[PDB]
Design a binder for this molecule. Structure first.
Ligand SMILES: Nc1nc2c(ncn2[C@@H]2O[C@H](COP(=O)(O)OP(=O)(O)OP(=O)(O)O)[C@@H](O)[C@H]2O)c(=O)[nH]1
Ligand SMILES: Nc1nc2c(ncn2[C@@H]2O[C@H](COP(=O)(O)OP(=O)(O)O)[C@@H](O)[C@H]2O)c(=O)[nH]1
Ligand SMILES: [Mg+2]
Lengths: 90, 428, 13, 426, 161
């Protein structure tokens, strides 16, 4: 297998650097590329537990005390709507 | 709500664990990135943004198969501190687990178990997955099971075991640290399902047609059994059995809780499309004397109680006919004090198929979990193996050096001997 | 060695 | 509205001071070139609490920088978000005051203190709506301890009715560069009890321990140690910047927390604290931030609160939330830790909501709290003080510039008073 | 997308057929060497399996397309005349792009195409509509079951839509 070492003569050209992981687990339980996926962390640094910001802040009075016709439309889009009986019964 | 913790102790617990959690993610359509692209619970905890995280703990004293999960395709899906790996292997030594380095893993494992045993409600069962004949599975399994029986008391625990096989064995100390492992399955376990290697070795080279089953194929077949066990919890079905009726209908006496497993239909895609697979012969092939997942001839003993977890397009009128067929069979015997002994259940989803696995999708499956008198001979082979050991005290210096006291060997002898005495006492 | 699973994210190596 | 005057003093104080102006500028959406970015009404309607407008519209800081070195003045000037600071409020002093309370308080620092009170004056009497001051400094050194408490004193007789609020940095015993911390800090506490009413204790022990444990950090640089401080600084004054449901204030904090007026020393917490590994993996809700705010390590001071008893606490929350869940979380955490609260103060928990979450998060909380475990560090650095004072350790650097030995015993007697008052209220 | 262009698919008698002709069938590529003892041993079994199962029915259920890795065009057609079902012409770059896609290399990734895994010659591979890994037949693989993995074909579930 010395013929495969002719092209990586420094090998630091990144072509063969870290191109294999050759275990039975990867033989048995893999599909297309969901092992080398980068971990999405935060766009604002170490504090930010997820992605959020000024485009999502809406204080309580503004967010719920908006006019009734706008709230009417918004919730119409989300599904707003001894005993005694009628004169039929005996 | 419903949830079961899925403590995976030992290297066999990890390898079985990444196959059962493979199948649970497949049947609920949950990707390794956690996103669905209310049945996710009993196995997954929703984390706000559609991030479903499994409900288990990967537990192994050595950092070689847990780290393999932390670098494989499920390095994301599993929570990082949910996976716990120590520094050294227990060297197939029960004293090295239960009386040595295992303590500094017990504290972290019981901590994370306590985290996810209070994040939701119900807490139906504590599924355990361990290898009895090995090291970290037997030792850290005995510590952590004994601690949960005190702390998280009055909650059922199901110990799926990989018990040593009679002629097949991969370690020469398995006779020692399995008799030294019965004393946790006898006093800290409500249900102990005995799966071994030989009876599932054979079940693949004549039914699955595979002349090279590897351990992954073994881990897929146990994954179908644990799936059909916990299917009646999550998914809506017909007449149903969950973990609490599972104990009140298979455990007649408090210390008789060592029972078998059988799964059908395990037939490949070149093969399963030729037969009926009807409800009569998929339970009759479940009671087939070679089809159990444990090396246990059922005919030198009488059956005691069985549950038949049918799963799929079964109708309750079809099960009563198949029950009648098995009862009229004169090969399967029954004890005289158990007139009715079949507590069946039916779910509505077909069993899920693994793309690339050597199985074809059928619309119904029979997983029987049967308590039998014939399970006594399974433990009796290694009663004879321990007797050849303890005559001249082989392998004792590795045990007594760590933490052993020389008398628990005889205590474990009397624990298995009194266990065998009760199986021949129940069936008279 | 120690927190290898973390230690690429703030500084890759 | 309510003007808040920020002054940062010392090599330590200017480094947290610059990091605090990274954080609140991110909260209010301001570029490092000074102009405003975005369409975010809820971060601009209360811009005057920390900012001033200035001719071309640049939101100029109300920030005052003092340090008797040409040291971190030009590093924060050349650094990011450093072109905000006025090139008038930079008062340098080019001789050095290395590790001496004398060269900050009595000699040297007394000639440049006559110009920094000028900068405090012309900034504050422009609008006579001052709610409080915000002083950042370390007591374990020179300029930060000496000139820092020197401005602390002279600001209080000119405005003897308004808050001054010190985010102090105490000795931090184990990790301690240089050797004169017990002399410098003990001879500086006795002003932080008299002309102070709001003191925030911050150690580098528990700041490192938060890094090593709740973040698991391997190479914690001095930048992100200050990022934890600046997050807690921005959370304790969130209501002066954003509208809320139960509106808090610095004076609402002061009236409600401190007993008898010399007990104003507070632990600080800011606890949505996770790593980036387990950053997607957390149900971020009110019942579990309460579990994280109330367990030892998360407190930024190295005094363990389970060895003492919270006399009065505060749970100043920030985010989208529902209020009976914070109310029942305060009541049950008082119920299980009944021995950790005081029997003659019912309901030892302040609550508030700043509505607008911090940047990046969705909910957070700043736990400022009076503890009678706080004398654990006071007896610790007084023990180091008396161990040096018995043998007359290095003192000629102090008394050579002119101070009496009688002044030092007055410092130790006044600080040993604070040990006794906490004990008899425990 | 179009997996095989309008002139890339050639059967016996050298008549071109398009991808439209390919629907309703179990489509498998056959990566093969002319001089390989492995391929030479496998090929009569593939011939017999193809003939018997395809004669046993009312439909052409399976169909295989041959991808050569021979040294030259003479060896290519000498293998071709032996070989009854479909194939691609050798110097079409579709063969080489299929080599890239399905990762069936022959140790010589390091000269030009330096990725990792090999999965060498021979390879029967049932494929999908847009080039899915439909299922791999274990000839020389982790199961490496020789001349008997053709039974593991799932031809009613792998179909060209
Ligand atoms: N079913 C199944 N059994 C396994 C597997 N791997 C090992 N075993 C069995 O487990 C027994 C030995 O224990 P191991 O699983 O190898 O490891 P362990 O129990 O954690 O003990 P240690 O090796 O000390 O870590 C052997 O008898 C094996 O037959 C597996 O992947 N599947
Ligand atoms: N948390 C924190 N501590 C610091 C910082 N800079 C210095 N220190 C601490 O303060 C001590 C040095 O005091 P220093 O600020 O240089 O004294 P000063 O320059 O006279 O104000 C050292 O022991 C450090 O541990 C910083 O940016 N953050
Ligand atoms: Mg193992």
């Amino acid at each position: 297998k010395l013929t495969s070492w002719r092209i990586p003569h420094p090998l630091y050209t990144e072509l063969p650097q870290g191109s294999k992981y050759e275990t039975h687990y990867r033989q048995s339980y893999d599909y297309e590329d969901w092992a080398r996926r980068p971990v999405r962390l935060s766009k604002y640094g170490l504090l930010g537990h997820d992605d959020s910001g000024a485009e999502s802040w809406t204080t309580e009075t503004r967010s719920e005390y908006e006019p009734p016709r706008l709230r009417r439309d918004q919730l119409k889009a989300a599904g707003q709507w001894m005993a005694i009986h009628v004169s039929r019964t005996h | 709500m419903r949830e079961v913790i899925s403590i995976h102790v030992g290297q066999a617990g990890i390898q079985i664990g990444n196959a059962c959690w493979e199948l649970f993610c497949l049947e609920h359509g949950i990707q390794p990135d956690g996103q669905m692209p209310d049945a996710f619970n009993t196995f997954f905890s929703e984390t706000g943004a559609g991030k479903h995280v499994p409900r288990c703990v990967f537990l192994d004293l050595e950092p070689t198969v847990v780290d393999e999960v932390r670098t494989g395709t499920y390095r994301h899906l599993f929570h990082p501190e949910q996976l716990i790996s120590g520094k050294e292997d227990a060297a197939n030594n029960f004293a090295r687990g239960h009386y040595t380095i295992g303590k500094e893993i017990v504290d972290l494992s019981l901590d994370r178990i306590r985290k996810l045993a209070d994040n939701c409600t119900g807490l139906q069962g504590f599924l355990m997955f361990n290898a009895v004949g090995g090291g970290t599975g037997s030792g850290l399994g005995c510590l952590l099971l004994e601690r949960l029986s005190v702390d998280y008391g009055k909650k059922s625990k199901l110990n799926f075991c990989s018990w040593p096989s009679p002629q097949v064995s991969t370690a020469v100390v398995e006779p020692y640290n399995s008799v030294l492992s019965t004393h946790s399955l006898l006093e800290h376990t409500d249900v102990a399902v005995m799966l071994d290697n030989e009876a599932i070795y054979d079940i693949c080279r004549r039914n699955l047609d595979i002349e090279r089953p590897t351990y992954t194929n073994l881990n897929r077949l146990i994954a179908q059994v644990i799936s059909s066990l916990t299917a009646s919890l999550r998914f809506d079905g017909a007449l149903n059995v969950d973990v609490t009726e599972f104990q009140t209908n298979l455990v007649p006496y408090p210390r008789i809780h060592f029972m078998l497993s059988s799964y059908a239909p395990i037939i490949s895609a070149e093969k399963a499309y030729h037969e009926q697979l009807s409800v009569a012969e998929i339970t009759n092939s479940a009671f087939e004397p070679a089809s159990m997942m444990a090396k246990c001839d059922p005919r030198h003993g009488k059956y005691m109680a069985c549950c038949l977890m049918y799963r799929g397009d079964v109708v309750p009128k079809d099960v009563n006919a198949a029950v009648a067929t098995i009862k009229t069979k004169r090969t399967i015997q029954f004890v005289d004090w158990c007139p009715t002994g079949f507590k069946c259940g039916i779910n509505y989803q077909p069993p899920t198929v693994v793309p690339g696995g050597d199985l074809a999708k059928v619309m119904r499956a029979v997983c029987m979990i049967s308590n039998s008198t014939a399970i006594a001979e399974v433990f009796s082979r290694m009663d004879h193996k321990f007797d050849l050991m303890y005559a001249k005290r082989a392998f004792v210096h590795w045990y007594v050096g760590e933490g052993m006291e020389e008398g628990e060997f005889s205590e474990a002898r009397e624990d298995l001997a009194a266990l065998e005495k009760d199986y021949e006492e129940v069936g008279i | 060695r120690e927190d290898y699973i973390r230690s690429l994210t703030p500084r890759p190596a | 509205m309510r003007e808040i005057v920020h002054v940062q003093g010392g090599q330590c104080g200017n480094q947290i001071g610059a990091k605090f102006w990274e954080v609140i500028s991110d909260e209010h959406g301001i570029d490092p070139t000074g102009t405003y970015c975005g369409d975010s009404d809820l971060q601009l309607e209360r811009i005057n609490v920390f900012y001033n407008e200035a001719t071309g519209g640049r939101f100029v800081p109300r920030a005052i920088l003092m340090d008797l070195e040409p040291g971190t003045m030009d590093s924060v000037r050349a650094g990011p978000f450093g072109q905000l600071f006025r090139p008038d409020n930079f008062v340098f002093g080019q001789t050095g005051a290395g590790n001496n309370w004398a060269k900050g308080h009595y000699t040297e620092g007394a000639e440049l203190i006559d110009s920094v009170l000028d900068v405090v004056r012309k900034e504050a009497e422009g609008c006579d709506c001052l709610q409080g001051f915000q002083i950042t400094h370390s007591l374990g050194g020179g300029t930060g301890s000496g000139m820092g408490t020197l401005l602390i004193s002279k600001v209080r007789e000119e405005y003897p009715d308004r808050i001054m609020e010190t985010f102090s940095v105490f000795p931090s015993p184990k990790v301690s560069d240089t050797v004169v911390e017990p002399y410098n800090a003990t001879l500086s506490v006795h002003q932080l009890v008299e002309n102070a009413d709001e003191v925030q204790v911050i150690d580098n022990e528990a700041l490192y321990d938060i890094c090593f444990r709740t973040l698991k950090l391997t190479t914690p640089t001095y930048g992100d140690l200050n990022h934890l401080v600046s997050a807690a600084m921005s959370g304790v004054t969130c209501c002066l910047r954003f509208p809320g449901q139960l509106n808090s204030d610095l004076r609402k904090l002061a009236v409600n927390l401190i007993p008898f007026p010399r007990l104003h020393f507070f632990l600080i917490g800011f606890a949505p604290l996770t790593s980036r590994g387990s950053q997607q993996y957390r149900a971020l809700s009110v019942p579990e931030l309460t579990q994280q705010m109330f367990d030892a390590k998360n407190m930024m001071c190295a005094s363990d609160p389970r060895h003492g008893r919270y006399l009065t606490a505060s749970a100043m929350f920030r985010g989208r939330m529902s209020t009976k869940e914070v109310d029942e979380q305060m009541l049950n955490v008082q119920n299980k830790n009944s021995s950790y609260f005081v029997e003659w103060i019912p309901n030892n928990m302040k609550s508030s909501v700043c509505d607008i979450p911090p940047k990046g998060l969705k909910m957070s909380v700043t736990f400022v709290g009076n503890s009678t475990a706080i004398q654990e560090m006071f007896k610790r650095v007084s023990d180091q003080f008396t161990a040096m004072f018995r043998r007359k350790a290095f003192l000629h650097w102090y008394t050579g510039e002119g101070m009496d030995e009688m002044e030092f015993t007055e410092a130790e007697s006044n600080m040993n008073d604070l040990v006794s008052e906490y004990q008899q209220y425990q | 997308l179009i997996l095989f262009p309008e002139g890339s698919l050639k059967n016996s008698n050298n008549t071109v057929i398009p991808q439209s002709h390919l629907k309703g069938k179990s489509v498998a590529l056959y990566f093969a060497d002319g001089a390989d003892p492995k391929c030479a041993s496998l090929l009569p079994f593939l011939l017999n399996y193809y003939r018997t199962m395809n004669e046993g029915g009312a439909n052409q259920k399976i169909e295989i397309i041959f991808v050569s890795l021979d040294r030259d065009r003479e060896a290519f057609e000498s293998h071709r005349a032996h070989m009854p079902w479909l194939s691609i012409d050798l110097e079409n770059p579709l063969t080489e792009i299929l080599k890239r896609h399905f990762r069936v290399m022959k140790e010589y990734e390091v000269p030009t195409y330096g990725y990792g895994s090999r999965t060498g010659v021979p390879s029967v591979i049932v494929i999908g509509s847009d080039g899915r890994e439909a299922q791999f037949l274990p000839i020389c693989s982790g199961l490496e079951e020789g001349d008997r993995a053709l039974l593991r074909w799932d031809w009613r579930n792998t179909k060209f839509a």
